[PDB]
Amino acid sequence: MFNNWVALNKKGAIVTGKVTAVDAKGATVELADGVEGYLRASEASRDRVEDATLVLSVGDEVEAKFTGVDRKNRAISLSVRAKDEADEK
């Protein structure tokens, strides 16, 4: 995914990942070439409770915000939303 990309492609952008594996608080979403980003417990929707939450499954993809990368793991952290930091600021 991103591991190659850091040289061509920068953070603050939106990337689509696919649901596939779980963390205790988490979903590790498949972002390709082996590596995963982050997906939150809400899954997606559009607003609140269930929207899209009934029609996206494990192996199906949603658009998340490209937040930051951890230097030690050499991978990307995704926040599920699209914009994230555009609520009031």
How many other CB atoms are there within 10 angstroms of residue 71's CB atom? 7
Span between the terminal Cα atoms of the chain, in Å: 29
- Could you give the number of structural domains in the chain? 1
Question: Which tokens belong to 69?
Answer: 């990368």
∠ Cα 17 38 28 (to 5°): 80
Q: Which technique? A: NMR
CATH of the domain at 31: 2.40.50.140
Question: Which tokens belong to 58?
Answer: 């494990």
Mapping DSSP to helix (H, G, I), strand (E, B) and coil, where does residue 53 land?
Answer: helix
∠ Cα 51 39 33 (to 5°): 125
Domain that holds residue 13: 1-89
